[PDB]
């Protein structure tokens, strides 16, 4: 269950 | 649905701080990078930082290192953004975001 | 900051006519992971904005058709085939490959009827 197909940014935190 | 749900509109006066809420919905909070945006009409949208909300991990933009303290609960689903020392270039849209999904904003307004 | 330039900063377009918005940055948004985090936003006065284009090319879900996008390295594009009236607003694209994550300053669409 991700929020969307595919993320915004890539991983970072 | 996916859902961010961020807390109502801020009065706060110059030299306070505030803290604004964000609860996600129909994703596993605890596994995606949630991120914190800035909109004023005279600088446009602006990257505040990015929490991993799993880990507590935050990775801040330079120009809001200080300013701007990510926090997160686990147990509520909600991501957490305190702004501090407010002054008259803080009053702002702000939004939480991950993954082209977008809170509906908070208003906060610097006044005494 | 990777700069994120926009053009035109305003676009005047009768409906059923084309529109294509141009973004351009500082730097490649090529991750060193492959994938390259280019973005298209729209929003509407007093309202979020939503997410049009991920990846550069993939329109997001209830995105119609009519809605492209291409582009890599520097250079990107955003190309409506026919404009319909609700699709008026401010473009933004944005990139997430560089730290911090930097925003194009908006392409206002705008409908001549």
């Known amino acids: 269950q991700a929020p969307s197909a595919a993320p915004s940014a890539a991983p970072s935190a | 649905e996916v859902k961010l749900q961020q807390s109502g509109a801020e009065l706060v006066r110059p030299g306070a701080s505030v803290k604004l809420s964000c609860k996600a919905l129909?994703?596993?909070?605890?596994?995606?990078?949630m991120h914190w945006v800035k909109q004023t009409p005279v600088h446009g949208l602006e990257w505040i930082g990015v929490?991993?909300?799993?880990?507590?991990?935050?990775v801040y933009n330079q120009k809001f290192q200080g300013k701007a303290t990510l926090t997160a609960d686990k147990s509520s689903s909600t991501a957490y953004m305190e702004v501090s020392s407010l002054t008259s270039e803080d009053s702002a849209v702000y939004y939480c975001?991950?993954?082209?999904?977008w809170g509906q904003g908070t208003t906060v307004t610097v006044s005494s | 900051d990777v700069v994120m330039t926009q053009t035109p900063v305003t676009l005047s377009v009768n409906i059923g006519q084309p529109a294509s918005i141009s973004c351009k940055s500082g730097?490649?948004?090529?991750?060193?992971?492959?994938?390259?985090?280019l973005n298209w936003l729209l929003q509407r006065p007093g309202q979020s904005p939503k997410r049009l284009i991920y990846?550069?090319?993939d329109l997001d879900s209830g995105v119609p058709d009519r809605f492209t996008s291409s582009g890599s390295g520097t250079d990107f594009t955003l190309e409506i085939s026919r404009v319909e009236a609700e699709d008026l607003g401010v473009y933004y694209c944005?990139?997430?490959?560089?730290?911090?994550?930097?925003f194009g300053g908006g392409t206002k669409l705008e409908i001549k009827r």
């Open positions: 975001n991950l993954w082209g999904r």
């Open positions: 944005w990139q997430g490959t560089h730290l911090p994550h930097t």
């Open positions: 929490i991993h909300p799993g880990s507590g991990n935050t």
């Open positions: 990846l550069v090319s």
């Open positions: 730097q490649s948004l090529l991750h060193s992971d492959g994938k390259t985090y």
């Open positions: 129909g994703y596993i909070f605890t596994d995606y990078e």
